[PDB]
């Protein structure tokens, strides 16, 4: 939609949805799916800033549309702290201690991603992991310890995004109204899930086209959780197939104020998911940066660098107060 921040937000969403669709290729219908498009876009923006040639191109096409200048504006607009709301995002870039970096690279990462580059002796790797994690933790008031598990000697850089969200519901649930209820994974496999309960004024609608219920759960801040429940859990692939920016706008238009009171029943849970994204991003067109013929020559000429590895790890905690959510994207660069 028209605004500058809105265009880049839909690019990032576009990236997210495209990624979602790849995740489905390897997810049994009992699996949890959870990831932050912003975290992943931030980490890849850093890689983009050092890319050249075919590698840069593939990466620009995936991240869409001074393209990256309005990405930092978006993050500035989103990351805020106020009563019952926190969204915080941090990029960190570690570099090999001997390794000369071009200044145009270090300054665009300081300006667009707010990271100064910290150098590290990855050769002494036990300590290298403790040092990196200790730095990350220092800068994120202990929300993110242990973001890094392992680091190769021949590692030349590691790029890190983390993102933390904690939102209070606009309508907080009463703990007194929380009893176990059969949650149906399936037609056959059920389980007892502490399920929360409230009568509040929530926007909802039946999606007739997708045979599923949509509901908007506001947080404090200007944020909310959209929850989409297929009626038959066999409708779930056609729901998950349609996800797109246009579908999102669809679901948001179909939502009215609809502010007569609603009877809501919602699970209380903490789930966490991990990914290795190499194959998914490869399918989405960014296969180049993992080759031994990758071009990351804007980073340094001293060595020929490629992306070794990209992990993404995320956690979702829903309870009576609200929602707590973390994500962490890590990129390892080698020769």
């Amino acid at each position: 939609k028209k605004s500058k921040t809105q265009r880049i937000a839909s690019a990032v969403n576009g990236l997210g949805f495209r990624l979602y669709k790849q995740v489905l290729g390897g997810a049994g219908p009992a699996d949890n799916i959870f990831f932050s498009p912003l975290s992943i876009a931030s980490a890849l923006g850093v890689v983009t800033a050092g890319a050249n040639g075919s590698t840069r191109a593939e990466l620009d096409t995936a991240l869409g549309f001074k393209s990256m200048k309005y990405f930092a504006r978006l993050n500035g607009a989103l990351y805020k702290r106020s009563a019952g709301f926190e969204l915080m995002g941090k990029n960190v870039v570690f570099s090999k201690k001997g390794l000369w970096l071009y200044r145009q690279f270090t300054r665009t990462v300081a300006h667009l991603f707010k990271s100064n580059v910290r150098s590290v002796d990855f050769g002494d790797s036990k300590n290298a992991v403790e040092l990196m994690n200790a730095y990350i933790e220092k800068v994120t008031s202990k929300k993110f310890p242990d973001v890094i598990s392992d680091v190769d000697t021949d590692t030349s850089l590691v790029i890190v995004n983390v993102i933390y969200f904690k939102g209070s519901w606009g309508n907080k649930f009463e703990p007194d109204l929380t009893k176990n209820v059969r949650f149906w994974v399936n037609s056959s496999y059920s389980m007892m899930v502490p399920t929360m309960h409230q009568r509040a004024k929530l926007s909802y609608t039946q999606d007739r086209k997708l045979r599923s219920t949509v509901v908007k759960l506001p947080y404090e801040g200007g944020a909310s959780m959209l929850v989409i429940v297929p009626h038959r859990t066999e409708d779930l692939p056609k729901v998950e197939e349609s996800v797109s920016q246009e579908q999102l706008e669809e679901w948001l238009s179909l939502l009215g104020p609809s502010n007569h009171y609603v009877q809501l029943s919602l699970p209380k849970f903490k789930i966490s998911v991990s990914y290795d994204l190499k194959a998914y991003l490869s399918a989405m067109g960014m296969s180049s940066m993992f080759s031994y013929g990758a071009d990351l020559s804007r980073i340094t000429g001293m060595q020929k660098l490629h992306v070794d590895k990209i992990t993404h790890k995320s956690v979702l905690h829903v309870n009576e107060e609200g929602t707590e959510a973390k994500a962490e994207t890590v990129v390892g660069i080698m020769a």
Binding site: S3, F34, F165, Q263
Partner: protein, 31 residues
């Protein structure tokens, strides 16, 4: 007028002004 999230569901946490999606997913198995 009733919403029961008793089955697998898609979940999106997003900013209203920018429509920026911050987390995406599907919850099929709480813990």
């Amino acid at each position: 007028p009733t919403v029961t999230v008793d089955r697998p569901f898609v979940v999106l946490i997003y900013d209203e002004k920018t429509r920026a999606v911050i987390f995406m997913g599907r919850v099929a198995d709480p813990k």
